[PDB]
């Protein structure tokens, strides 16, 4: 189905305390496969997934020099924004950069991304037509003209439309089914009596990849939201994910409640009904 390659850049300026720190992290879908950390000794690009290890020494040297260049690029970018906003040496500011390409089952690009954020707020981002920019305030409008000043989104669209999708394709066919195939959730329902009056049912989904899941509780086959307590999807640590949904139910009416699991790795959506 749909696949995506994304790079996440975080640059944070440290006043007095050394010079800003740079972190890179690379994702195919939501498997991390590379990283870079400027705070390290011998700061290299490092492999974070087994199917990228086969890349030649020139892959790793080349990317290390990219991140080294990228770090220095963001240092002076941090200064320019300080000036746009008239901020002080008293201030630890942050530059966040994210780019990547989303491909369908085609091999064709569906949405490319190139967005930045200053100090948590959105600064500038590239419009889906990959020719335009959208600036959040008057500061980003100087960047927006800086970035029609050297005719830039041309080189940025060319990466997003061009080599970004091919790099995704190369990493997909090298990671084989362990990265292209979706791993389905192992689902079960647990029952905890909370009192004489009541009890909880918890719908567990575990072991799934990718992380996009939907868990719903129903009663008498119709929807029920005002007792649901969902948890945010959490990493298991072994490249799979976890989630649960819970409902408090009158003791004796448990069998009237069905949990409903949607996940791409499932052939058809699941429904689970706790049986005494």
């Amino acid at each position: 189905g749909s696949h995506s390659m994304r790079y996440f850049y975080t640059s944070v300026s440290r006043p007095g305390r050394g010079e800003p720190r740079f972190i890179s992290v690379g994702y195919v879908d939501d498997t991390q496969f590379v990283r870079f950390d400027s705070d390290a000794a011998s700061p290299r690009e490092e492999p974070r997934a087994p199917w990228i290890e086969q890349e030649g020494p020139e892959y790793w040297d080349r990317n290390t020099q990219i991140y080294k260049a990228q770090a220095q690029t963001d240092r002076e970018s941090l200064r320019n924004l300080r000036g746009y906003y008239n901020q002080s040496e008293a201030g630890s500011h942050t530059l966040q950069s994210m780019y990547g390409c989303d491909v369908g089952p085609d091999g064709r690009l569906l949405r490319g991304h190139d967005q930045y954020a200053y100090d948590g707020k959105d600064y500038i981002a590239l419009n889906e037509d990959l020719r335009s920019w959208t600036a959040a305030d008057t500061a980003a409008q100087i960047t927006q003209r800086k970035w029609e000043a050297a005719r830039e989104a041309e080189q940025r669209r060319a990466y997003l439309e061009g080599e970004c999708v091919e790099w995704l394709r190369r990493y997909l066919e090298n990671g084989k089914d362990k990265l292209e195939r979706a791993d389905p959730p192992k689902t079960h329902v647990t029952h905890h009596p909370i009192s004489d009056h009541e009890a909880t049912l918890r719908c567990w989904a575990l072991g799934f990849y990718p992380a996009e899941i939907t868990l719903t509780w129903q009663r008498d086959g119709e929807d029920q939201t005002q007792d649901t307590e969902l948890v945010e999807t959490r990493p298991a640590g072994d490249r799979t994910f976890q989630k649960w949904a819970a409902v408090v139910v009158p003791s004796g009416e448990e069998q009237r409640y069905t949990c409903h699991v949607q996940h791409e790795g499932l052939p058809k959506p699941l429904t689970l009904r706790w049986e005494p």
């Binding site: 970018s77 930045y116 960047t143 800086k146 080189q155």
Partner: peptide
């Protein structure tokens, strides 16, 4: 692999 063309903000 990461992009290689740089600009300043």
């Amino acid at each position: 692999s990461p992009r290689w063309y740089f600009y300043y903000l």
